[PDB]
């Protein structure tokens, strides 16, 4: 049951994987399946998540106060802390199209 798989960062952190690789990994997976990867936008990370059967990509910013999707929520000290927050909190607060949580690590 617990601990949830998100605690093993290897289940969702796919390092320097590009967009096309991410889409290949998420193809056919259920809603809420996700990964975290480096972005083509240097200095940034990206979250790729299945929403309504489709893969969406969101930038993760790193700032002096922490990682986050947008001000004033760039509050997390590590990517793991971010992931754990959004495992229980829907991304809809940032965009009404994203009604999903980070529920299922791609490799759990």
């Amino acid at each position: 049951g617990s601990p949830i798989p998100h605690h093993d960062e290897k289940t969702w952190n796919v390092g320097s994987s590009n967009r096309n690789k991410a889409e290949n990994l998420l193809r056919g997976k259920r809603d809420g399946t996700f990964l975290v990867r480096e972005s083509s936008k240097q200095g940034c990370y990206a979250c790729s998540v299945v929403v309504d059967g489709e893969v969406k990509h969101c930038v993760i910013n790193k700032t002096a106060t922490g990682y986050g999707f947008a001000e004033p929520y760039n509050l997390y000290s590590s990517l793991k802390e971010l992931v754990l927050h959004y495992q229980h909190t829907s991304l809809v607060q940032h965009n009404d199209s994203l009604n999903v949580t980070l529920a299922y690590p791609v490799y759990a």
Binding site: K56, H57, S97
Partner: peptide
């Protein structure tokens, strides 16, 4: 990328 506010 999806716009996030």
């Amino acid at each position: 990328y999806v716009p996030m506010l």
